[PDB]
Amino acid sequence: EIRVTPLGAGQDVGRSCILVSIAGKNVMLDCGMHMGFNDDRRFPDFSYITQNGRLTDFLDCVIISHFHLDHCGALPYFSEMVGYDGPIYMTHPTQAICPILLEDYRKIAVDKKGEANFFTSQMIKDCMKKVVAVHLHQTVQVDDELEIKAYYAGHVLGAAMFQIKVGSESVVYTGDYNMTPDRHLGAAWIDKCRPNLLITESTYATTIRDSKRCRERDFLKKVHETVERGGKVLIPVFALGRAQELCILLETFWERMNLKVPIYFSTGLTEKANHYYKLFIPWTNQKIRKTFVQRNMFEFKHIKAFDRAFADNPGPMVVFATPGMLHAGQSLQIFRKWAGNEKNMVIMPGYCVQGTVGHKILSGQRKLEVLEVKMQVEYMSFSAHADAKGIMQLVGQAEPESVLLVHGEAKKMEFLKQKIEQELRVNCYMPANGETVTLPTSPSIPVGISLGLLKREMAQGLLPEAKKPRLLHGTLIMKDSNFRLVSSEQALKELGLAEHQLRFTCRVHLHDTRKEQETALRVYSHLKSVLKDHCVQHLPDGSVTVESVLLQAAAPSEDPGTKVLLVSWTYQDEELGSFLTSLLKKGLPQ
């Protein structure tokens, strides 16, 4: 059976981790932290999975989805001071990019919180030495019976859906994903594999996001308005994903509109991010991988590095800066520099965490903590998550047997549960964190078959005698290693048992005045006339044959009014023999 225990993201967001038991094997899908709890509760609870035992002994394999912090932030914590040496599977791009993000989070955690029992850089290097990398669609056997497979996702670069299949059992974990083809990230594509379970997120399940293309049309027309008014444009984005998406979008638009105004990009992570985006071309869909023949799209002709004196250099300006939530805010520094002007513009393309300075800016008051804002704001939605119709399309393509919702908010999750149960009549599950849910399976046990027996039975099925029970017969030889199905004759010659023959001879007593030779002739003619489409032949020694049933007029008995007919048959045609004896008990025509 299927056991699913989410340690995190149970009716919640962040610190996602799911423990899946399939046929007694332990697959741990994803392990990250989450902001908001400065306590150890941001890390996933380990007192259930192994209590205080051995993680490598109890758990069997680790799967990592993508390089977002709430998904790959907890690997050195899970594997280094808690202790784990088992297999960790994650893609080559995500493997290349997670340690840099981990190092940045480590430095930021030192500079903000300074937790004493915190993972160190050297054992971060040790963990990324311990991890194992997997290509797309590569069926990787963790051991003999357990294998994993990757599917392209589109949440970010390197993101991967994962299908975990043991025997015929199959659980597909989407992780985070998208259906909308990004300007540099392709849509998620899956085989119609019919999984037994579908673990999925639904971050945006109550919002039907509209036309993406018209959304960047709105963004481009307003940024064109601002640069034609000569103002300053500041875009607070986090430096991974959407940053390079907007970079490609503005590179295309600026080249086509043939403009000359300088633009700048936030430093720090730009060199590493752009290096990885250059060196991981075969993940960024067929547009960029086709354009790679002439040029390289990630090599930017108009985008340079930002300079703090270029900040107060005058003229029209467009700058991408960090971060998206403005907690530290060199972007907030330039915001405070440019807040006096009414000409300048900002676009906030992501959902801000409420109760923070980003929430103060998102709300409409002038005074934010206190400084008064004057330059114009916009709140756009360039999020790369999945929507309601996209989720319905994914489940309709995948056709799973049951689904399980994580990574979102509870009322939204319930709305999707109601809608999917009304739509596809497929069972849904809503685990809380720390809750184990159990689902029954259909473990069909394999068996062999003789090819000749298969060929003749398939020929009989192809013959136009269908819809009648043809009664597939044979026997199952069991060795506890190779269960096989064989024919009866094949089993006999294999096992050496004698082909036993059973014979019945009934003495039909016929009471009539006809002669015995004429009685046998009457038997032959009567059986030929009654049994239509039956092999009724007259053997020249005076006998009758009906298929494999032999009728012989026996020696004259002591009763002149009684004639003995020996009807002889085997067990295989003994229904026909019983019918023949019933007809002869009814008697010959006279």
């Binding site: 669609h137 069926t139 394999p446 398939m458 096989r484 006999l492 048992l497 019945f504 003495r507 295989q572």
Partner: protein
């Protein structure tokens, strides 16, 4: 299973394998042996090749004076170069269903099969294979083009004249099916018919078969294939390199435990020590540079070029020759470098870690940054502005019969100080260099090979132990170069059957079992029973449901086996209610009489017989009794 081999070439195969209900063909050879025979194509018409004298028929009937030309006592044919095809008429390639590719050299011949013949199924190859293949077919079509020489001769292609001609024109094989080169619309048609695959990807075909590619390691993305059904395994290995090379290392774990192993793509020069000849290359290159001339190296834009540039990077750092520049000249040079740059996950662990520590896996990007090596698409233009002497040139085509290679050595043939270095083993350099003879150029033949030698073949076969082995006749037979040597032939137990060009083999196997599934409710219903220790069996009664060649059983005539004992028979008749039953014995059987219905039963060894009157309910009672006193099969 049946195998049709359509290529007598050991390295460039086409193998049509017939297994179960599907047809899977492997690889695509485009033998440039006829290209070697044809005359070279100058980019600009050289006076000496313009006025090469015409060899004449001794009878004088045919117009071979203008159909053929002679040079240095040796004869060549004057036309556009041709290409030898695999014999396509042995099996209808339309009925051939699914095509697999090992590597780009084995996909060179794809538009021929995929456009003209009428094949309409699917084709599989890995991403680096298909991309480097597209680059190679682009270069090839460009060089057969870029100067159209539309002349074509056919009276030499007449068989009698071919017999009358001397060797190697006497030695030409299958001249009739040689064809002219293909074009961009054909290239794009095949390259849109392609589909993709990564390593260890399980591709199911109709439920009938499943195919997986494994890293052979010879080239970037070069892949051996594994075709399996649930009891049958065919390992097709073509061109692996188990030495430490730039691609992913060879993976024999899934290769082992195979029913039929087909082995092709072995070495051409078994006696070649690769790294030693690479060092000799570097020494000769340094000698030529110190002498102050120009060196030519003809090479394909994959593999050997990358290895050569790495070693030359180390050696130029060793010898301090940063003054002399390197020019890589081919119309596919820029895209070749970029594709080799971004193809990272297909490499080995050293280069993957180099990626993981933000630097490019190959050092020639750093070489470009240091401007020692410059790439150029064609010799006309800015390359003519930036040319230097002394110099190094790696040129586009290694078969030497067309391209910037032939133009450059027409330029440099008079001088002796310059040097040509052959680096690819796919042709005989004697027949390659025959047309330019006499030649003042220093020629040094140091071929570079990574295909596994026969020692490693023996080691690999002893490691994997397959049931059947299939290898070419040229690998069974001793080579003509060293027939005395014994290690040059493949040895296997059992000895492998060979094959010749356009040959048919029936592999030693009989199909016995296949994969069927039971359904859990029916498995619950079925109850096994035991007659022998360790043997428990159960009769079955089900309904087969077969969609897409996969088979399953669901609930909607067995016979008897086993002798019945007379003593237990009469004992259970007495304990069931039958009485007054008398038994007499015979030589081998027992006659038992039941007085009710006057039933006489004789029991013998594998013989039982019941005779009674016209009775029904007693008869069916005895029916169920005698059938329940045995085991059902």
């Amino acid at each position: 299973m049946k195998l049709y081999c359509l290529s007598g070439h050991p390295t460039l195969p086409c193998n049509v394998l017939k297994f179960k209900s599907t047809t899977i063909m492997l690889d695509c050879g485009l033998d440039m042996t006829s290209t070697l025979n044809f005359l070279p194509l100058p980019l600009v018409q050289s006076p000496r090749l313009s006025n090469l004298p015409g060899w004449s028929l001794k009878d004088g009937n045919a117009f071979l004076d203008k159909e053929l030309k002679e040079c240095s006592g040796h004869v060549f044919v004057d036309s556009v170069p041709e290409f030898c095809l695999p014999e396509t008429e042995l099996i209808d390639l339309s009925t051939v269903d699914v095509i697999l590719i090992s590597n780009y050299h084995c996909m060179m011949a794809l538009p021929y099969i995929t456009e003209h013949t009428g094949f309409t199924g699917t084709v599989y190859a890995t991403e680096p294979t298909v991309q480097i293949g597209r680059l190679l077919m682009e270069e090839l079509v460009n060089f057969i083009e870029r100067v159209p020489k539309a002349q074509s001769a056919s009276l030499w292609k007449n068989k009698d004249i071919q017999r009358l001609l001397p060797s190697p024109l006497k030695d030409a094989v299958e001249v009739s099916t040689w064809r002219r080169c293909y074009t961009m619309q054909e290239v794009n048609s095949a390259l849109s018919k392609i589909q993709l695959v990564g390593y260890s990807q399980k591709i199911e075909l109709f439920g009938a078969v499943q195919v997986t590619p494994l890293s052979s390691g010879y080239a970037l993305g070069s892949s051996n294939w594994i075709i399996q059904s649930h009891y049958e395994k065919v390992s097709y290995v073509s061109g692996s390199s188990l030495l430490t090379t730039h691609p992913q290392p060879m993976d024999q774990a899934s290769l082992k435990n195979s029913d039929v192993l087909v082995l092709t793509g072995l070495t051409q020069i078994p006696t070649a020590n690769p790294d030693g000849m690479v060092g000799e290359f570097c020494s000769n290159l340094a000698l030529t540079v110190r002498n102050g001339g120009n060196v030519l190296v003809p090479c394909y834009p994959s593999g050997v070029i990358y290895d050569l540039l790495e070693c030359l990077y180390q050696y130029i750092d060793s010898a301090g020759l940063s003054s002399v520049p390197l020019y890589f000249i081919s119309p596919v040079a820029n895209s070749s470098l970029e594709f080799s740059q971004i193809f990272a996950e297909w490499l080995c662990h050293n280069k993957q870690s180099k990626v993981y520590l933000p630097e490019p896996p190959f050092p020639h990007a750093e070489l470009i940054q240091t401007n020692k090596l410059k790439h150029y698409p064609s010799i006309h233009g800015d390359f003519s502005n930036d040319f230097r002497q002394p110099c190094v040139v790696f040129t586009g085509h290694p078969s030497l019969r067309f391209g910037d290679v032939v133009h450059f050595m027409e330029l440099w043939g008079k001088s002796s100080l310059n040097t040509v270095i052959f680096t690819e083993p796919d042709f005989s350099y004697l027949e390659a260099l025959a047309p330019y003879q006499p030649l003042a150029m220093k020629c040094i033949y140091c071929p570079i090979d990574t295909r596994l030698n026969f020692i490693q073949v023996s080691k690999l076969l002893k490691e994997v132990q397959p049931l059947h082995v299939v290898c070419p006749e040229q690998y069974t037979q001793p080579p003509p170069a060293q027939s005395h040597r014994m290690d040059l032939m493949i040895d296997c137990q059992p000895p492998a059957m060979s094959y010749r060009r356009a040959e048919v083999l029936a592999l030693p196997f009989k199909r016995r079992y296949e994969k069927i599934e039971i359904m859990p409710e029916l498995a619950d219903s079925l109850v096994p029973m035991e007659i022998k220790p360790g043997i428990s069996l159960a009769t079955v009664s089900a309904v087969l449901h077969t969609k897409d060649n996969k088979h399953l059983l669901q609930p909607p005539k067995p016979l008897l086996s086993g002798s019945i004992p007379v003593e237990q028979f009469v004992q259970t008749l007495e304990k069931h209610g039958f009485s007054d039953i008398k038994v007499e014995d015979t030589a081998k059987g027992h006659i038992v009489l039941l007085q009710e219905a006057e039933t006489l039963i004789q029991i013998e060894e594998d013989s039982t017989h019941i005779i009674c009157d016209n009775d029904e309910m007693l008869r069916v009672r005895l029916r169920d009794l005698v059938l329940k006193f045995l085991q059902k099969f």
